[PDB]
Amino acid sequence: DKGEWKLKLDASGNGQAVIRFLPAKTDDALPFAILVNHGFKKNGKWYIETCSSTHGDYDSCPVCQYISKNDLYNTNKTEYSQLKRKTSYWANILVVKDPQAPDNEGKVFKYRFGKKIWDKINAMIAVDTEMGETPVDVTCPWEGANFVLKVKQVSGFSNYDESKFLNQSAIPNIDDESFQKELFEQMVDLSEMTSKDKFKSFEELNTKFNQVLGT
């Protein structure tokens, strides 16, 4: 009821589903949105904000400024790991199979994910064409491929190692214009996730950052 789809886990902490990453909503759009941010707690307070480096602006981020000016990477590894920028991704997807919530099947939602899954998408296209490997754009409605989402609790964390892409396949009914029109219709504007309004001014961030660090 918000537009975002999530994999629902069981008591054991297991989850599986089949999703289909969708292509760019428009010709000048991208199938993925890249977002960077910071998230850490200090003095009983949380600093959870987007990082202006998402669009190459490190100056407008107080954390990056702090990390850099204090050479934390070299003077305090620990602190560095806690405060370092974190990259995630957004995409539009078509839920194929969702055992835990069958009502999602056949619908389009925005889906967020990390490097572990992003690499699987890229490993499909960044192949060795010198050895004859066939690249595959998994987001193509005709020659893309469904992705099986598998989660398992490993060492207390959600592990996605078993997630993988299946064989290439065209989306069913994709040739039907009405279906195709509705599919792209339900896709949300991914650039919206990285627009200017998603970043607070430097002064506001710095103010919050300082209260979190106690300055």
55 is in an annotated binding site: no
Choose the binding region for Zn ion from 4-12, 59-67, 124-132, 178-186 (rule: CB under 5 A).
Answer: 59-67
Q: Which of residues 152-181 bind Zn ion (CB under 5 A)?
A: none
Q: Which is nearer to Zn ion, 63 or 138 (by Cβ)? A: 63
63: contact with Zn ion by CB under 5 A:
yes
Distance CA 82, CA 36 (A): 14
- Which of 17, 22, 33, 51 lies at the binding interface for Zn ion (CB under 5 A)? 51
Smallest gap from residue 38 Cβ to Zn ion (A): 6
140 is in an annotated binding site: no
64: contact with Zn ion by CB under 5 A:
yes
Is residue 185 a contact partner of residue 176, using CB atoms and an 8 Å limit? no
212: contact with Zn ion by CB under 5 A:
no
Residues in the chain, overall count: 215
Choose the binding region for Zn ion from 15-23, 80-88, 107-115, 168-176 (rule: CB under 5 A).
Answer: 80-88
- Which of 22, 33, 61, 193 lies at the binding interface for Zn ion (CB under 5 A)? 61
Tell me the DSSP string of 160-206: -TT-EEEEE-PPTTTTSHHHHHHHHHH---GGGGGSGGGS--HHHHH
Contacting residues for 110 by C-beta, under 8 A, at least 6 apart:
3, 4, 5, 90, 91, 92, 93, 188, 190, 193
83: contact with Zn ion by CB under 5 A:
no
Choose the binding region for Zn ion from 41-49, 61-69, 133-141, 143-151 (rule: CB under 5 A).
Answer: 61-69
Helices (H), the chain: 62-69, 72-75, 77-83, 115-125, 177-186, 202-213
How many Å separate Cα 206 from the centre of its chain? 26
Annotated binding site: 38, 51, 61, 64
Which positions touch Zn ion (CB under 5 A)?
Answer: 51, 61, 63-64, 85
